[PDB]
């Protein structure tokens, strides 16, 4: 199937409590494989998946230098952004950055990404053409013209079309035991009486990978969209994910209702009922 690689970065200033905290993590699909935390004792980038441990020491040296350099540029950018927004040096502010690439089943680039947010709001984003920018406001237009003058997008494009895709393909081969295995969900329906006239039907999906999944309740074959409670897909802690969908049904109506499960790890979309 299609695959993705993403690097996420957060810097959070804390005036009066030292320099900004910097945390960055790398993902392939929904699998964490590297992390770096500026508040660790001897901060280095560390493996978080078995198939990245085989990379040699100079891979880890270069990766650590890049994280440290990024930590420094975020600190300068946070001070810069205080000026751009006429803000006091007394508050805590947040800088977020994400970049990465998507590849299709044949391993060619589907699209690349590079975007930033300030205080949780979009700031500047590389467009899908990998050559122009979208700035969210007039402060971000300042950055956009600095970045156009330095030709940042040309270097990002070379990276996103070159090493991003090439190293993602390498990671996918080395971790193919896990990265190229879909784990289907274990599914069942539970029943929880509410009152004499109502009960909850809860449709479960457990232990699945990757996180993408669809759970729908139908009543007489029609989607119960507006009346279904759908919790966010959540991590089990062991690489897999969980989700449930629930619906409140009049007692004695239970068999009008069907739960529908689609997951890439399932040959056919499943259909489940409750049975006492």
């Amino acid at each position: 199937g299609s695959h993705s690689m993403r690097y996420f970065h957060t810097s959070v200033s804390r005036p009066g409590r030292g320099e900004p905290r910097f945390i960055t993590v790398g993902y392939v699909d929904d699998t964490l494989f590297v992390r770096f935390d500026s508040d660790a004792a001897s901060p280095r980038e560390e493996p978080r998946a078995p198939w990245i441990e085989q990379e040699g020491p100079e891979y880890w040296d270069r990766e650590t230098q890049i994280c440290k350099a990024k930590a420094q540029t975020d600190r300068e950018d946070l001070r810069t952004l205080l000026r751009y927004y006429n803000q006091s040096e007394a508050g805590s502010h947040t800088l977020q950055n994400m970049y990465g690439c998507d590849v299709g089943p044949d391993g060619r680039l589907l699209r690349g990404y590079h975007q930033d947010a300030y205080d949780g709001k979009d700031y500047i984003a590389l467009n899908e053409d990998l050559s122009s920018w979208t700035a969210a406001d007039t402060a971000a237009q300042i950055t956009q013209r600095k970045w156009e003058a330095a030709r940042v997008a040309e270097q990002l494009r070379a990276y996103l079309e070159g090493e991003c895709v090439e190293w993602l393909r390498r990671y996918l081969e080395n971790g193919k035991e896990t990265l190229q295995r879909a784990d289907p969900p274990k599914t069942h329906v539970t029943h929880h009486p509410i009152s004499d006239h109502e009960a909850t039907l809860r449709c479960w999906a457990l232990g699945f990978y990757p996180a993408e999944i669809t759970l729908t309740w139908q009543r007489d074959g029609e989607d119960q969209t507006q009346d279904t409670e759908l919790v966010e897909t959540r991590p089990a802690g062991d690489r897999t994910f969980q989700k449930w969908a629930a619906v409140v049904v009049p007692s004695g109506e239970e068999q009008r209702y069907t739960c529908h499960v689609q997951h890439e790890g399932l040959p056919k979309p499943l259909t489940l009922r409750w049975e006492p």
Binding site: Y7, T73, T80, K146, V152, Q155, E163, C164
Partner: peptide, 10 residues
């Protein structure tokens, strides 16, 4: 494999 400008400032 991470990217770095081979500096980019906001």
């Amino acid at each position: 494999k991470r990217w770095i400008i081979l500096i980019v400032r906001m």
